[PDB]
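hey so u asked for the seq, here:
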Amino acid sequence: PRRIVIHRGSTGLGFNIVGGEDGEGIFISFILAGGPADLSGELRKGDQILSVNGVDLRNASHEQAAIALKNAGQTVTIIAQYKPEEYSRF
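ran it, structure tokens below
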């Protein structure tokens, strides 16, 4: 896992997430070109989001993860782990 710090833009953090069903974690599914996640050079499709500002998201619902990202403020600290494998299957 790695720590990535990004700052919110006028259309958000610049990525989308899928997952959150059952056991399955929250995964990045889309990186907006030119947005904050894109220009971090660290976030990518297939990353699992483990935590946002210290809030554990490993077991979170899609909505709970969405809410956490919305409420994380202007400086958003993500712990992410590239898991290519579970992303494709789930």
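The radius of gyration is 12 Å. The beta strands are 2-7, 15-19, 26-31, 47-52, 55-56, 75-82.
lmk if thats what u needed
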